[model samples]
Structures are given as structure tokens and as C-alpha cells.
Target: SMSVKKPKRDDSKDLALCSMILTEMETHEDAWPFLLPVNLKLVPGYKKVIKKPMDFSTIREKLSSGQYPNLETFALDVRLVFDNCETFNEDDSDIGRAGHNMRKYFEKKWTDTFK
Candidate 1:
């Protein structure tokens, strides 16, 4: 017997997961750097170097607004925060290290919660 129906949009479960993971990241000690977008004025080169910058506040806004269509989109924006950070700062630097830690924490949460 074969039974495979077309899956309908299920945003609630995905939203719940996104919200929980984001909250944990926001409260994390190393979340300072990722809490907000990098200051383009202070770090003038940031805007120039990072084409697609992302941050926790932005992700939260997106989540709150119900902008994410699925978990994949939500996850991509989250990853953008760390990927952009590594591109702009050295690994050992304050912000850079923070991003790495946050990245690890997010991944762990993503796997554990999503699994």
C-alpha cells in the first residue's frame, strides 16, 4: 500500500521551533555581537564586504511578523549572522568568537529541537 498525500503548509510547528531557538540564542552570553546588525557607520567596510548581513533582532522581527514561509528560510537567516561575522572579523576577535559560540549553540539547538 502506498499513501503519500501532498503536504500542506505547516507554519506553526516550524514557527515554534524557530522562536525557541532564537530565544535561547538571544539570552546566550556570546549573543551580544549577534543581537543587532553590525554598525555600518562604525564598521564602514562591513556593508561593503558583507553582501547579506543578518542579526537576531532582524530574525526575531521576521519571526514575529510571520514572514518565514518555512524552517529552511528561518535557518538560512540565522546562519547568515554567523557566516557574515566570520567573513568580517578574525576568529579570535571578540565579535568573531561570539559568533562562533552562538553558531555552535544554534546548531545544537536546531538539531536537538528539530530532530
Candidate 2:
């Protein structure tokens, strides 16, 4: 008999870390678009239930409500947003640089904060 594997569940610590990163991103409006891309098609929605842009408030509310099934989904969504940018150099474009910086901030601070 074949067995099915259950999906991984997020713990309180994972949720807390994800929430902190999102909240910090919210305060940085310059990088907001990096997480909530202007193009809707590229942005990740709520498990096919909420087909709207993942803005700061939406992320916060949904996360707090346990809407996102896992942290991977949230991280992937943010990565998708950042990947949509055209460039990453400050001299090339402010928006692009902001997106890059946002990713950097998350990487640098997530581990430190959690640790």
C-alpha cells in the first residue's frame, strides 16, 4: 500500500519570524513594491482564495489569522516580487535597489532576530 505524505506545518516561532520580517518591510515603503509588486500576475495570492496583491496589511492580517499554510509560501511570494524587478543597482534605479535591499535586510536580520 502506498502512503501519502502530509504537508509540513508552521510552528509559532516560524510564524513569529515571518511576521516580524513582514512588519519590518511594512515600515520601509521604499521596498514595499518589492514584496507587493505593481504587477498583480507576479505577486502571490492567498492559496487561490484571495486573488489580490499581498500588501503589508493583507500579509499581516492573513498571517495573523493563520491564512498562509506555511512560511515557505510567504517567502516564495516575497522572492517572486523581488525577482520581478528589472535591475538591482542603486545607480540604475531606485525601485530596483530598494527591492534588492529589502531581500538583503530579510536575509541579514531573520537569522539574527530568531537566534
Candidate 3:
């Protein structure tokens, strides 16, 4: 039989939705700076300043773990990325603007698709 697209709702478990969001986040135009861990040498004191450094790769790993609880758990880390961004980067800075835009995108996707 040919593969058929299944019709369904994605409001229950957030695993797929998390994966979906993370996928978009990774591919997003503003995702470059956040795609991986911040180089400690490139940005001195990044480790010392931002205690909880969050990145898209880590988020994707959590989503792949299959034990991810819900959107609430996922949201925490996603928000952390932006929160840390604001703390380390100036609002007018290029990276700061990217963080702002990315955060807005994530929030919209979260609320619009599931929340």
C-alpha cells in the first residue's frame, strides 16, 4: 500500500509538537547564534556569567529523549535561551535582536500551535 497521510489532532502529548517547534527553531534564519553552545573562549566569561546556558541542540536532545514531560518542561529551557541572551547581550546588539526575534517566534508558535 502507498503511504498515506494520517489526519489527527496534536493537542495532547507535546512530543511531536516539541520536535516540530525545535525543527523550525533549528532551521530558522535567526537560529545561527543559538544552534550550538557558545564558545567560552570567543565570549569570555560566558560560562561565568550565564550559569544556565541553553541551546537548540540541547533542546533537540531533550525532545529526542522521549521522556520529555510536557510543554511546561520544554518551555523552561526555551525561555532560558532568551533570558540568558538578554542578560549577556545588549538589546540593541545584533545578537540581542536575533534573540528577541527568535523568542517572539517561539512564543507565537507555542501559543498558536498548542497553548
Clashes of each: 0, 0, 0
**Alpha-carbon deviation at 84 in model 3, angstroms:** 0.6
Model 1 per-residue lDDT tens digits across residues 1-115: 2797777665567778789889999999889888888888998788889999899999999999979888989999999999998998899899888888888988998898776
Q: How close is candidate 3 to the true structure, as a TM-score?
A: 0.85
For each candidate, what is the lDDT? 0.87, 0.64, 0.88
Residues 1-115, candidate 3: write the lDDT tens digits: 3787778656575777788988998999989989998988888889899998989998888779865676788989999999999999999989999999999999999998775
Give the poorly placed runs of model 2, Cα more than 4 Å off.
Answer: 1-10, 32-57, 87-91, 113-115
- Lowest lDDT sum, 10 consecutive residues, model 1, at 1-10
What TM-score would every model get versus the actual structure? Answer: 0.88, 0.59, 0.85
Which residue runs of candidate 3 sit more than 4 Å off their true CA positions? 1-12
| Top TM-score model | 1
Error of 2 at 98 (Å): 0.8
Model 3 lDDT, residue 108, Cα: 98
The lDDT of model 3 is 0.88
Q: Which regions of candidate 1 fall more than 4 Å away from where they truly are? A: 1-11
Cα RMSD to native, each candidate?
Answer: 2.9, 7.2, 8.2
